[PDB]
Ligand binder design. Sequence first.
Ligand SMILES: Nc1ncnc2c1ncn2[C@@H]1O[C@H](COP(=O)(O)OP(=O)(O)O)[C@@H](O)[C@H]1O
Ligand SMILES: Nc1ncnc2c1ncn2[C@@H]1O[C@H](COP(=O)(O)OP(=O)(O)O)[C@@H](O)[C@H]1O
Lengths: 459, 459, 455, 455
Amino acid sequence: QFRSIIRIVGLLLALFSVTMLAPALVALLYRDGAGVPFVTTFFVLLFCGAMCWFPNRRHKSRDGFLIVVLFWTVLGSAGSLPFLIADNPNISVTDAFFESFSALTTTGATVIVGLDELPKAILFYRQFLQWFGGMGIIVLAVAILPVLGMTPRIAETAKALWYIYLSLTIACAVAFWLAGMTPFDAISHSFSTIAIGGFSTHDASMGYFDSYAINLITVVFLLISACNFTLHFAAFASGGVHPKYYWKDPEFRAFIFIQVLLFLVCFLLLLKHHSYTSPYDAFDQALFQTVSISTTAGFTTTGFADWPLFLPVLLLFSSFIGGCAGSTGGGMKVIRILLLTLQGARELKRLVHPRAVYTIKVGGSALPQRVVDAVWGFFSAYALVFVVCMLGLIATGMDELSAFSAVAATLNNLGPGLGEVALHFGDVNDKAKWVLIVSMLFGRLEIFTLLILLTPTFW
Amino acid sequence: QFRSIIRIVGLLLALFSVTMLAPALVALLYRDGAGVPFVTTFFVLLFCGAMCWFPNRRHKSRDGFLIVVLFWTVLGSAGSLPFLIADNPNISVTDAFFESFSALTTTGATVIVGLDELPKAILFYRQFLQWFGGMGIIVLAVAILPVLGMTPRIAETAKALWYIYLSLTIACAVAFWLAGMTPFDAISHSFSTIAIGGFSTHDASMGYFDSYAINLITVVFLLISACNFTLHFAAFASGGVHPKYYWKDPEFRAFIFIQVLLFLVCFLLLLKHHSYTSPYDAFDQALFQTVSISTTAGFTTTGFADWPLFLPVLLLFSSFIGGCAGSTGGGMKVIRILLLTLQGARELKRLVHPRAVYTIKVGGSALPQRVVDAVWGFFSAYALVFVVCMLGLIATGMDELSAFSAVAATLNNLGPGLGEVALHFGDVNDKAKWVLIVSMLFGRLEIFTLLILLTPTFW
Amino acid sequence: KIIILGAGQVGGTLAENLVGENNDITIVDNNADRLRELQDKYDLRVVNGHASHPDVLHEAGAQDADMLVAVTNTDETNMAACQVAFTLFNTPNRVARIRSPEYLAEKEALFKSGAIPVDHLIAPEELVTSYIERLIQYPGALQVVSFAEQKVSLVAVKAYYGGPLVGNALSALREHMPHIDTRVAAIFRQGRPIRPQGTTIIEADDEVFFVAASNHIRSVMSELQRLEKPYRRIMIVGGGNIGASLAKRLEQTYSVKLIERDYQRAEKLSEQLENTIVFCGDAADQELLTEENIDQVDVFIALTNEDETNIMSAMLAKRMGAKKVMVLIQRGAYVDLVQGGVIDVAISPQQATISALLTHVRRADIVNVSSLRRGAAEAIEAVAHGDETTSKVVGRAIGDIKLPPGTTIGAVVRGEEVLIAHDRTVIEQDDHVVMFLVDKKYVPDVEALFQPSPF
Amino acid sequence: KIIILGAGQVGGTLAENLVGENNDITIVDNNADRLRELQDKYDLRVVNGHASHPDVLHEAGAQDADMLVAVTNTDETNMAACQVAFTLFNTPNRVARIRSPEYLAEKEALFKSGAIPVDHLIAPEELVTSYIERLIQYPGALQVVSFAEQKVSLVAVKAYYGGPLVGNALSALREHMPHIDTRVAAIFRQGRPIRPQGTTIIEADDEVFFVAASNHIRSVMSELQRLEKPYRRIMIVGGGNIGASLAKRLEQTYSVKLIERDYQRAEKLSEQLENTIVFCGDAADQELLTEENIDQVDVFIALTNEDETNIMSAMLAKRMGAKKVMVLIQRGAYVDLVQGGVIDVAISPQQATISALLTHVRRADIVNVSSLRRGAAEAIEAVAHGDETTSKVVGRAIGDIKLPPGTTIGAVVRGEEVLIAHDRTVIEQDDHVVMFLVDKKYVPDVEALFQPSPF
Ligand SMILES: Nc1ncnc2c1ncn2[C@@H]1O[C@H](COP(=O)(O)OP(=O)(O)O)[C@@H](O)[C@H]1O
Ligand SMILES: Nc1ncnc2c1ncn2[C@@H]1O[C@H](COP(=O)(O)OP(=O)(O)O)[C@@H](O)[C@H]1O
């Protein structure tokens, strides 16, 4: 039932128009920052929402793919207007689409240099875009399961998640502002530490602040926010039924295993090279950089200047196994890697028991072969999209190793990539900048919702 | 039925002793270099075979696993002994085990420097070990397929393969000697270009014989030897029944696709940088280095001095998708990658039409879900063995990036890895040298035959 | 909070009309079909588990549950479930569906709530499906639906050749009962609708729809009962728990021939059923129907397990000479499809319970609330919502409304009094309007007509 | 070159003994059973697809390919199957299976004319019954196999209480036929073997093993037929195509009581079978067997589909009083395990044909060629290979050979003459020696004993 979607697109960018007022209000409060574009975009987008709003088929599968693809593409193009209009960050239309999509698609990639001396309105709207697409992630991925990767209501959990997602950004902005942060920077950095985005109002990201405490708080709320929000729902409903309901979930166990292993290997390697003069500093910077990049957040506290190149390469590779399935960000979620391990173990267990019936058991329950087949269709789509994106960047003349890093940074929704990229996407080739936008779009929707559109069998 | 294996072990090393006599005779013929260790080793090996043969016993699945693991390990140790005895390459016991295993396990890795000025016996016996383990590979992987990813006669094909394997090395040593190669170096380099080994009598690999013809011949017989020998059987049985039975096998099609793509991307990249002054040179060196490393052969014609750093890394990564499933020498076989692609496409097509029965059809036939489950159990075991090998090398103090390269060179049975362990493995840490031997053993056994033995449930 | 139970065919319909109106609905099916159906359904959530173990019940039992509707396929288990619920948890008002039927014969003390069932009201599939007797009892009656409380009832009757309705002009029907205030909604003839103004009722296929107060409707139906010569013979092709009990209920008053495919079931029936000639053969072959006076049978009831066998056998008995044809459809897509000229009436066992029990309870109000039947027609019960003149339809007169095509207002229920619709009357706020569509694809258009400008 | 065809109830077993030819062997079964089972339990070739389309057949070769085996459940398909091969592919040596048996009735005049399509050679799986009939005669004849092209025959007889063997010492049996040169191999008593020379045969179910030339065996078995009173009561517990045709073959000469569990099959038997009392009940319940004179039946034959039902029912009829018990075992693992003493004889349809055909099949001369029976016992036909001294055993005397424990040489065949190998064993022997093991796990050692020093 194609072409009856425009009603939803209008109703959607009308909500997105309403969201523009809050950053404009923040602009008025400070009174600096050229907030005229925010009200301009408010009017242009509310007008666009009214222009195409004819109810046709309301109510009391192949369309939903074209719904969420437009929920990200349309909303990115709509959010690309404030950067296009304003003057203080005078950036090309391409840089505007890039910054808007990356802000909304949760990928920490940026193309504006000089964030410190920037209008507090714009770099607030950036973190608010991250927060918005942060809600959008969990509202989609938990409540739309054609591609999943005793059962409660859709809307009651659609708002229980919103309540957790707000008690978290509050509990984190408070601790940030308690650790010696402007309440503005505290809100702007909780919008991006809970959504697992990677944005900051400073050119140094989380390196501008130099406090052990903010680093530990970011580590804590990154682990909390990368965790499956459906599992936090157990911590919300009726209050504290257990505090160790987490450790029962084998996805949580694999996540903590990965984080601890990658941490202590990065720490030992950070000590073999004497990269830091004080082991308490190697500990701090290791724990923060592992928890930031492994969990696909994208925050950085150092320039990797003294870091042996293995550690940045290992962190970039670890960005593939990102956040848990029921949470923001990530590339191939940790549960697909737990499934990979479990299936390898099954094939091992068939060593002496050919006639035995082994089944992929996750937390006591068995998995249907369709889901387990989908996880590896996803691995195949990830790989065969990665290669095409990398060859596309290389074709546009981009540096090759740098292309491979930018691809692994965008497809994973990281999004700081090592090499010629870290950290500004300014001097990137323009065509390669568009191919990057396509890749970061691929990162959301789990690489299938968008890939299907290219398939001939769809049309 | 443990301890009934000793008879086979004795027979195997007795045959090995006869093989040892042939290199010794070549040593006496050329009048240089120590043939005395060869004769001494022959006597020791035959004595061990009789001391271990004792009297055979009753004829009679786990036994087969023990047989193949014992076969590779025992013959590698046997090869180690000849080096141990001689004086001209005065090398530690570890360097001797390394060179013997790498010669026999087809991994082109070497730890002896000064190959040119070496006894023609030793550097002949090295290529002969490569030739021997080449037969071992194709005879096992084609004739021992229970859990080792129409049935004709076992022995008639066990020797039809040997006939193809000799009709190839003859025509290739001949084309070499027609290219100006020394008849010694022509035999010694067909032993290693057909067995897909990577060994040479010269420190410069195939640089010493710097001929366009020799390079093109190596490329041709590497593609031929990278092809599934079962498919060559169709070109042999009842004469030349078809010459294009190959193009029906979709594994061949995927192999040619991979080789052509990787070739022309390496060539275009080798031209964007003007790395070579003459396109006739860029073509030669690109085609030869891709065909050598992608097919896991391990030959090198250049030092990557003018090569952009992306290309050696791309070749190393391509060494994972090695030869065909029946062919000699491989990492994860190309057919497992065609299966991965087919399954990704299947899941994509099954997302548009959810209530549909799709099956992975390869060449018209459907694949049982057990085989398709085994291919991904293999991918998982490969990955989780790679990581353990890398962390083991790193633990012994080896350079990290170099560890990742040595692992990808040995587990793939390449075996020249870029970086610290670039041209020679001689200065590699000793513990890391043992972990390397273990890794190449894992890679020869298809990551399962050995991993199974470590499990307690086996015994 | 309202909970329902079981995998029973009916529960789904109980889970569609009841939704909304400040009550949160929960369904607890049993394991397989219940999981799908549960997953499939609009609104409220489903936990998959046996409907008698207390652990699955604890979600409902003490957390302010409003009404417990325990409807299950199996009765003996359902009773144990209802008692486990009562004795373990409060569950103050509960409902149980048991097609025992033997238990229905004796309510005793168990249905007195001392022990075993502790239930307010029990719903039975069999006696509520025995409205088929009311259909055979009232000759030429295709359907009856009710609106508002119990005041107005729409009825769909058929005029048979040789009946009293053939040839008589609609003005004679209106003058034969000058004290009856009825309103003819529409008349379907050969499948196509017709505008009724005082026309002559063609014998072969005229279907006449009455809209009037239930007292008047029951009086015109009693008068047609008196005039039309009653049915003498009846034929049944199903051996099931419904067919058997229907043969039992009919054999005393009519001559019944029953057909079965299962030899042992036929034998068990011939033992149980006296005065009922029980056969053994497929309902499909003509060589049995013609040989058994198919040309002389009056009513042919098809109660097979398979719906398609019912439809085809009964369409064949209709072709061969049966006067009235009835089938048992367990798939709403089929009942919406075959209940036309060929098949006089299809009895969905879900709607047979739903219409009767749901209509009395709560008088559910929604801008459009439909009663589901066959044809391109539909019968809805619009509610006039909005201020006196704020709404498109409130305060204005029936003759002035821009109703969709074929849509005819039949009656207006004002509180406790019923008025037969006329262009002289004016619609009031919170007035129940009984309507009738000829093409049901205009159901939304009527909703838009009654949907005010959003606040 | 050998081919057999799918799926094959027996054919698979026809695929294990026949592989001894030096020339190439191929077996192609019907589908997965032939391939998967076939590849796992078999050695060199095969094949696929339903029969009898021509596409599967050309794989056999048929370019002067010598062996074709048309194992088929149904005859009508089998004839066409062999014909498509000859016409399209022209396979020279052709063999067929027909259980029609009206065609089996007329094929001696039809098939022995040359007009018949392609299958002059025949093999019926249902002529094993004749062997059961021979077992019912010659009372107390558990088994016979023939070695050296039927030159020498080993026989396993059972001594029943009241028979002619009870009480008589083996010397009296030796003196009752002074013109017969036989060799008592071994005597199993209560399961344990015993040294037999000059011992009194204990009446309770003694099993005595003769080994002699075919003339001597054919004479002593006829003499035992003459002395022992023949069987008169036979009970069968299977309604199968084998059981029915056996009842047909037996009913005229014996009083047959047959048992079936499927009523309709029992009715069809009672129609077909005259003079045979056909029952309807489980072969397991005693309440029928005792009620039916189970204590007085002579031969109890079990021809059920399931082996375990045969074994258990027949062990129960053996406990209750049956003199001889026979079963139908479709798993050699069972016949090697249960059948001694408790179950007198099992008719493996595989070994029933194989024993005769392998003997007639050339050449069956290997260092060890095994004909296998019931129990741990063994009967082998070792071949002494090697020069005057290169072999452990050629030229030397049996009393000087270090034979495994319990192993007793029964006869020695040279050419056309047979010697009983008494004492010194004067011999010519390049030539074939017939042995008898008590424990068959010593078969390889005898191979080692007869295997010369490897070159
Ligand atoms: N073609 C047919 N003609 C006559 N009877 C039929 C036919 N198909 C099914 N039936 C019978 O319907 C009878 C009762 O239906 P049943 O299966 O008991 O319904 P339920 O599944 O609800 O218990 C059975 O005796 C069945 O044999
Ligand atoms: N106690 C029993 N249990 C099972 N089957 C029995 C028993 N007694 C007799 N039978 C009969 O054995 C017969 C099987 O004969 P057979 O011809 O082998 O079956 P099929 O034709 O399927 O091969 C069936 O009639 C089966 O009912």
